[PDB]
Structure formats: C-alpha cells, structure tokens
Design a protein around this ligand. Structure first.
Ligand SMILES: Nc1nc2c(ncn2[C@@H]2O[C@H](COP(=O)(O)OP(=O)(O)O)[C@@H](O)[C@H]2O)c(=O)[nH]1
Ligand SMILES: [Mg+2]
Lengths: 164, 785
C-alpha cells in the first residue's frame, strides 16, 4: 500500500446537524435530502493529496446506538446553525473528548447548514469567539451547497499532519 | 502437574465448544457464527489455551499464579497489547439477567472499586464512553448496600432482563498495584484451601475480582475466564468449563459462581461421556449436521493442541479422576432437577420417573435470581422448548403444565417455539394452547421487546410454520413491536424471502418503516413485487420517492399510470419528482419526466431551481444532466430567492471547473450577488484555485467590495486562517497571479474587516509577507492603521 499517512477522523455532534450529509458530500461528492443510513456502514474513506503527499482519510460517523471510536487522530465536532440547542451541547461534546480521548488529538468546530441563511440562529463571530477562546479552528459548511466541505476536512488533515 | 487428560479425551471433532458460548450454538449454527465474526479467532484462542498448557508443564517447579504468565496468556490472545492498563477508560454494559441481589452486595462491598472511583450505575451509551444519570460509588454508605442491592436490581430488571440500563467503567488508577495484591491473595488462600470444594470457591472469587478490575484494554474475558480459570481447573484434576453464559463474573456472588462453574464442568463431562457412547450429541438445542462436522476437521489447524493429543498419559489412571469429579457434581441434582431435566434428559422412562407425582406449584416453578443465568425466570416448559427436548415437553404437557406463563424477558413457551423454529414442538404447544378458553389472548402476548409469538416466527422460521400460525386466525398480523417493525418488516430485513412472499401474498398492510429498509439495500425488485402484489401502494408519496430516487423508468412509469401529479412536492423541503430524479439514478428518468411535461420552473423550500439539484449529483453525471435540463428550459440564471446566487455559484463551491466553465460558456450571467453582498468572485476567490476562470469572469463584469470585506482577494486572506507552512509558499504564490491582475483593475484598498483590520494588517498577521506585503506596498497599498 505505502500511502503517506492514513488518518483516522471522527464526526461527532447532536443527531440531526448533518454528520452523515457532510461525510457523503466529502466521500461520494453527492447530497440527498433524506438519510440512507448507508445500511449502517459506520465509516467512509477518501484519499487526498495535501503538500505533494497522498493521504488516506478513514472517516467514522456517529450512530444513535469493540471500542474502535477512541482510535481517531482528529475529531470534527459538528453543530447545526439553524439549531441553538445543537451549538449549546458542543461544550459537553468538547468535555467528552477531554475524558475518553488523548488531549494530543486535533479538534475542529463545524457549523453545518450554512445554506439555510434565511433560518440562521447561531452567530458567525460568537462561535468563532468561542472556538478561538479554546484555540480550535472554526469553519461553517453546507453539505447541500458543498461550501467549505473539502476545506473542512483539508484543514483537519493539515492540522494533524503538522502535529503528527 | 495439571491433569488435562480431559482436553486430550475431549473429542477432537467437537472441541470448538470450549471457547464458543452455549447460548449461540442453537441460532449461530454452532461455531459458524464465531468463525463469521472473526475467522481463525477460536483457532488462536484454542492455540492460546494449548500453547499456555505446554508452557506450564515443561516449567514444572510447583508452578504458582505469576503476573508475567497472566500477561503471556494475553500475548497469545493478540498503544500496545499484552501491556497493563494505566489511565485508559474501559467500560461495558451488563444486563439484569447477568446480575444477582447477592452478587451486587459483593460488587458494592469491594472497597477497591469505591476508592479507585470506578463509574457504576444507570445511564445511556456515548460514542467514546458511558454517560451516567447517577453514580453509586461516590459517597456510598455501607449500611445502605443491602436495600440498595435490591433497589438497583429492580431498576436493572424493570428496564429489561436481557436489556441494559446500567453501564460500568473500571478504575483508571493503581491497576498494576491492585492486580498484584489479588495475584498474591490467590496464592495466600490456595494454601488455606482444606476442602476439595473450598478450592473451587477461592478460584472463582479471585477470577471474579480479576474480571471486575478489567485491567487489559480488551480480551479481559478470554484471558481470565476461557483460559486462566480452565488452567486452575485442569491443575486440580477438574475438566475444562464448557459454559452457556460465562459473562456473569461481574455481578454474580462468589458461591453463585461455584454453581455456574460446576454446571460448565458437568457440561464438559457430558460431552466426554456422550462421545464414548457414540450417541448423537444435542446440548442447548444444537444438532451437528455431518456437513459442519466434516468441514471442521480439514479446517481445524491449531497444532500446539495436536501435540498434546499425540502425548502419553498411561502413567496416570483415569478412574482416580472420575471419583474426584463426582464429589463436586453431586450438588447440582437436588436443586431444580425438573429444569436441569429439560436440558440434559432424553429417556422417557427416566423423564416420566422424575415427573412422577409433581405438584402444580413445583411443575410451574420459575427459578428466582442468583441461580445460573439460563434458568432465571424459566418454567421447565421454557427450557424443554428451548433445548428441543420433546420427550420432556410431552410429559410436562401430560401434567397440564401452565404454558401461558412468560419468563422475566416476557417470552412465553410459544415465543421460544417460534424463535428456535422447531415446527414439531410448536405443533404440540398449539394443540394445548387452543384448548384453553383465553387462547386468543395467550397467542397475542407481547414480551418486553414488544415482539409477539408471530413476530419471532417471521424473523426466524419457515412459511409452513407461519401458515400453522395464520391458520389459527389470531388476526394480529398487522401489529408492530416496540421498535415499530411489523411482522413482514422483520421478515424482509433478515432476507426470509419465501416467508416474506407468503406474508405479502397474505396482503399484510405495508408499513412506511419497511420502504426505508428497501432504500438502504436499494432493492428495486422487492418494491416491484410489492407494487405488483399490493397494486394500490402507488398513492404512497414515500413509495413514489424511492421509485424516483434510485428506481427504474419502468417503476416510475407505473406511478404516472396510477396518475398522481408530476409536480407533487413529496419531501420536507418540497422537492419535485423531477428534482429527486436528478440527484441520482438513470438520466433516462429525467428526460422521461421532462417528456411527460414535468414543470422545470419550480423551487424547493430554499428556492433552488432544478438545475441547482444537478450539483447535488456526483460530478461524473453532472455534465449530461445540466445539458438535458437546459435543452427544455434555458433559464439557468434562475436562483435561490433565499440567497440569490444561481448554479454558477454551486459550480464554484464544489470546485467543479468543468461545470463552472460550460455554464459560463452557456452565457450564464455574472450580475448576481447573495443577500449578504458576496459576488461570484468572493466565492471563486480561493475555492476555484485556478486563475484561467478568474481572468474570463473579470473580463465580463466589475467586482464590488461588500459586507466590509473588499472584492475576493481582500476576503481571500480572511478565509485562509490556518496558513499551513508546507503550502504557505503556495499560499503567498497564488495571490501573486491574483494581484498582478487586481493591480490592472486598481483595487481601492479600503478597510477589509469590521474590527478595522485591512489587507496589509491581515497579510502581516498571516505571515505570507515575503510576496504580498512588499508587492502591495510597491503597488501603493496603504500600510495598516
Ligand atoms: N438545508 C440543509 N439541510 C441539511 C444540510 N445538511 C443536512 N441537512 C438535513 O439534515 C437531515 C439529516 O442529516 P444527517 O446527515 O442524517 O444528520 P446526522 O444525524 O448528523 O447524521 C437531512 O434530512 C437534511 O435535509 C445542509 O447543508 N443544508
Ligand atoms: Mg448519522
């Protein structure tokens, strides 16, 4: 195989923010309005060439229900911009990586559903202010528009490459 | 040193049973399931027990329990493995059915759990570790413990007997200390050991605490129970332990575990004794078909065992061993011999004798908690039905044994008769059930999973069985379980086709939940059978969706034959059929809907045209779809009123230049701008990452700075926050080919932030200076204020 890094990534956040929609838009480069559940595949893979170096990304999606979920090199904490409660629970998600994962692990805050501008509750700068207080990179994304989806995973790939 | 004659004597054909749990054999076709799970894992686990067997015999030296061996056995099991745990959280779920009131009292009584601060109590699962509603270890009064034991068993049980409300995280400090003060404490009491049985009590009491500590990252069970316990058993001339449920060493009392082991001991002896008889073997309702038996021997491998088969044990006399085993296996008979009868007995003469003059309170006795986990809650009927002991079932039916009764799980005799899928024992049950007055009731009993007798028969069994269940005229075919899965729905998910066809042919009302399962597998044909056999499910919106999304032109044709509007909104976001036809599937479908006169000029909840939906499809099929749809309409300029940017924007942010170009080539206008004031360039600033387009777009129109972030370049640097060092030469290089263009168009160079930041302060903060900072300053760009 001999592929440069083979990173393990993990999308976690309140059920509905679009962890699945994000992954399929990154992996299969598609978007469907419903959730297929990909017959509980439980993960997705994509190989990306960053800094003239071919990197494989093993990306795991959080479901509703042998402890493989600690293995991740990076965790993308997702929230819904159109759901205040989904951003409020981000704090508890950030302290559930402080417990059951290495503090060396690379974090990234993603505000999904950026395209629903008409129904936006969570403020850009408020989230950035919060994300920059903890020294975490922050990006807003739309799995629908596909806006910043590549950039979201590219920054996370680069953020760990640096430290790793 | 250790006897281990039993292992050699153990029939080499069927020695798989030492490492596979008895609760699987019935449903998982013996070892198949364990092979399917992890192939050659039992071959390594058998190797791990037989490679340690050779290493504890050649050593000699009256070998005592060593920590360096307790590690070695985990190295045979397979961040590094075979190493002790240290500040690594490892938790797990344990049900009420693997617990006892006295076992809880022993679990809470262990101070080293309370001191170590091991999270225990109820709560739901999390992606990494558990999340607890209460913790029973923080501030625990050891005078509350006895009433608290029952109180938590009531909580564990009232949620479900085989379900889990209660998780347990192990102590994450002093692992190497606690393990050593037990390993020593075992060598301390094996000395004190006076009675032959008293030896068996300290072994389990020690291997319990070993299991409760949960040091090793993984494989705490296979190392401490399937291996270590056997070694300790084999050493005192007791056989290996062939368990049904060996995962009770968490919340089962020390004395209660002696029973579980003695049972597993008796189980092994039974395999040995039956193999000599040359009688067919059927324990925990598992028949061995010649196919499975013959397919094993050529796939057996595991040679470290093969050498302790071709080994001489003539020096030791076996009959000195037999008289020793019977001493501890004479205790099992007295307590619940009817239930144990249902598991092991065959001879009707012996069965009839046992049941001779049994009272109605004794014949319908549900074993209470504390007893081994298989028995707890079960009438002898239940066990008789489970293990397929028709001989025992006949004599219990002859005593008019109550079959309406249900175990702690909520399953009746009829439930297990369906689940285990024996039509012959199911037959004997029905005849008795129909005789009762409340038979219509008895039949329609739900377990704690909600699933009726019929639901289990659909998920597992044959159409002839289902026929013998429907002939009754229960007419509760349509009812769902607690999960909301109908009889036919469960049947579909588990690929029970001939059953599913019989339930479909029977015309069971279709459930929305099933159509979503058909979507996951993308099963076009089964929907084709459903729409054919039902032939009024074409009104169903969600059935038309799955037909449009992946389904053939043929499937969709049938829905327009039925005749429902071609522009009916049929998702949350009010998507059209035509819109959903683009997302994925055959472009022949798109062209058909357009032929049928499908309205091109509609907008979903978010205002996105049909041509927007092209860019929700994989980039391969994007080019064809865009051409097919623009042939009919040629209104691509149409855009989400919500934002106000057309597909050219969609094309930029997916980085699909091929579409971004073809669309501009199609004379796509560049007048547009989102509500927040951003132009196409604002998007094509960095995302496009190619100057060829940027040249051709700037040729058309003038860019305009908006939302206090000038043009694209000004906002470019505000969006590159990380500025990765390896690509920082590439990042200060793209802006070269960007700016030598901008300088032509005399960018005003205003403030480029709402906090007074500008192009020169940002680039200075960005540390991309080497290129820009000077080239801006030369170009006359004002320094930061
Ligand atoms: N408008 C809009 N809806 C989205 C977006 N991402 C996800 N959704 C919606 O979220 C729902 C479920 O998404 P899913 O990925 O399953 O969420 P998860 O529970 O986090 O996996 C879908 O029905 C989508 O309509 C987005 O970028 N824009
Ligand atoms: Mg999901």
């Amino acid at each position: 195989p001999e592929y440069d890094y083979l990173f393990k990534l993990l999308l976690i956040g309140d059920s509905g923010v679009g962890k699945s929609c994000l992954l399929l838009r990154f992996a299969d480069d598609t978007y469907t309005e419903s959730y297929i559940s990909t017959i509980g595949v439980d993960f997705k893979i994509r190989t990306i060439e960053l800094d003239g170096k071919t990197i494989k990304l093993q990306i795991w999606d959080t479901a509703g229900q042998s402890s493989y979920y600690r293995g991740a090199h990076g965790i993308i904490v997702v929230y819904d911009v159109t759901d205040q409660e989904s951003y409020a629970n981000v704090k508890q998600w950030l302290q559930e990586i402080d417990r059951y994962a290495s503090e060396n692990v690379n974090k990234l805050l993603v505000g999904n559903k950026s395209d629903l501008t008409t129904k936006k509750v969570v403020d850009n700068t408020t989230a950035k202010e919060f994300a920059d207080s903890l020294g975490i990179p922050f990006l807003e994304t739309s799995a629908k528009n596909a806006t910043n989806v590549e950039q979201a995973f590219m920054t996370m790939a680069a953020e760990i490459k640096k430290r790793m | 040193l250790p006897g281990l004659y039993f292992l050699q004597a153990y029939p080499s054909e069927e020695i798989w049973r030492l490492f596979v749990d008895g609760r699987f054999w019935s449903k998982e076709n013996g070892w198949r399931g364990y092979e399917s799970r992890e192939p050659g894992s039992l071959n390594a686990a058998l190797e791990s027990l037989c490679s340690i067997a050779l290493q504890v015999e050649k050593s000699g030296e009256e070998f005592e329990l060593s920590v360096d061996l307790i590690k070695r056995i985990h190295k045979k099991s397979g961040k590094n493995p075979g190493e002790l745990r240290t500040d690594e959280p490892v938790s797990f779920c344990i049900p009420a059915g693997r617990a006892s009131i006295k076992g809880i009292e022993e679990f809470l009584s262990l101070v080293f759990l309370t001191e170590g601060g091991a999270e225990f109590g109820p709560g739901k699962a999390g992606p990494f570790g558990p999340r607890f509603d209460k913790n029973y270890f923080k501030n625990l009064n050891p005078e509350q413990i006895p009433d608290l034991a029952k109180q938590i068993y009531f909580d564990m049980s009232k949620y479900g007997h085989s379900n889990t409300n209660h998780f347990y995280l192990a102590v994450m400090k002093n692992v190497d200390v606690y393990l050593e003060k037990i390993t020593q404490s075992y060598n301390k009491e094996i000395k004190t050991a006076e009675t032959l049985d008293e030896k068996l009590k300290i072994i389990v009491k020690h291997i319990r605490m070993y299991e409760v500590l949960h040091p090793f990252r993984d494989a705490n069970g296979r190392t401490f129970v399937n291996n270590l316990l056997n070694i300790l058993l084999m050493q005192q001339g007791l056989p290996p332990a062939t368990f049904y449920e060996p995962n009770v060493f968490d919340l089962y009392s020390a004395e209660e575990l002696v029973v579980v082991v003695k049972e597993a001991i008796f189980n092994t002896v039974e395999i040995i004794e039956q193999s000599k008889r040359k009688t067919p073997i059927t324990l925990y309702g598992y028949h061995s078909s010649l196919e499975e038996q013959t397919k094993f021997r050529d796939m057996l491998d595991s040679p470290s065992y093969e050498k302790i088969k071709h080994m001489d044990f003539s020096d030791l006399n076996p009959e000195k061993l037999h008289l020793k085993t019977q001493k501890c296996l004479s205790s099992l008979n007295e307590q619940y011999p009817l239930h144990r009868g249902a598991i092991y007995l065959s001879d009707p003469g012996e069965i009839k004798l046992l049941l001779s003059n049994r009272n109605e309170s004794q014949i319908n006795q549900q074993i209470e908690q504390g007893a081994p986990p298989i028995y707890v809650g079960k009438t002898p009927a239940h066990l008789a039905v489970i293990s397929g002991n028709m001989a025992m079932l006949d004599e219990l039916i002859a005593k008019k044994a109550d079959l309406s009764l249900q175990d702690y799980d909520g399953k009746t005799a009829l439930h297990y008769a369906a689940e285990c899928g024996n039509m012959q024992i199911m037959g004997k049950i029905l005849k008795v059930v129909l005789s009762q007055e409340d038979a219509i009731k008895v039949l329609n009993i739900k377990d704690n999973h909600g699933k009726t007798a019929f639901h289990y028969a659909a998920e597992f069994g044959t159409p002839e069985l289902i026929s013998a269940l429907t002939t009754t005229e229960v007419i509760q075919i349509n009812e769902p379980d607690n999960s909301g899965s109908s009889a036919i729905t469960l049947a579909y998910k588990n690929h029970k086709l001939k059953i599913f066809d019989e339930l479909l042919n029977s015309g069971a009302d279709i459930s929305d939940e099933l159509l979503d399962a058909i979507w996951a597998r993308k099963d076009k044909e089964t929907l084709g059978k459903i729409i054919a056999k039902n032939e009024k499910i074409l009104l169903n919106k969600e059935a038309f969706r799955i037909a449009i999304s992946l389904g053939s032109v043929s499937l969709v044709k049938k829905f327009l034959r039925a005749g429902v509007d071609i522009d009916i909104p049929l998702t949350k976001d009010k998507a059209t059929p035509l819109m959903l036809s683009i997302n994925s599937g055959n472009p022949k479908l798109v062209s058909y809907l357009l032929k049928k006169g499908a309205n091109t000029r509609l907008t979903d909840t978010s205002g996105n045209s049909v041509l927007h939906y092209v860019f929700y499809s994989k980039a391969e099929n994007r080019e064809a779809l865009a051409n097919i749809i623009t042939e009919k309409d040629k209104k691509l300029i149409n855009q989400p009123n919500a934002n106000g940017n057309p597909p050219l924007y969609n094309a930029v942010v997916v980085n699909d230049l091929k579409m971004a170009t073809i669309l501009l080539e199609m004379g796509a206008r560049v007048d547009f701008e989102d509500r927040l004031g951003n132009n196409i360039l604002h998007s094509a600033m960095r995302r496009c990452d190619l100057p060829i387009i940027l040249d051709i777009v700037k040729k058309d129109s003038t860019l305009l700075h908006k939302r206090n972030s000038e043009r694209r370049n000004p906002f470019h640097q505000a969006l590159h926050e990380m500025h990765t060092f390896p690509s920082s030469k590439e990042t200060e290089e793209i802006h070269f080919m960007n700016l030598s263009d901008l300088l032509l168009k005399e960018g005003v160079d205003l403030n480029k932030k709402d906090i007074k930041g500008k192009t020169i302060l940002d680039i200075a903060l960005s540390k991309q200076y080497f290129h820009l900072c000077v080239k801006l300053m030369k170009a006359g760009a004002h320094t930061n204020i």
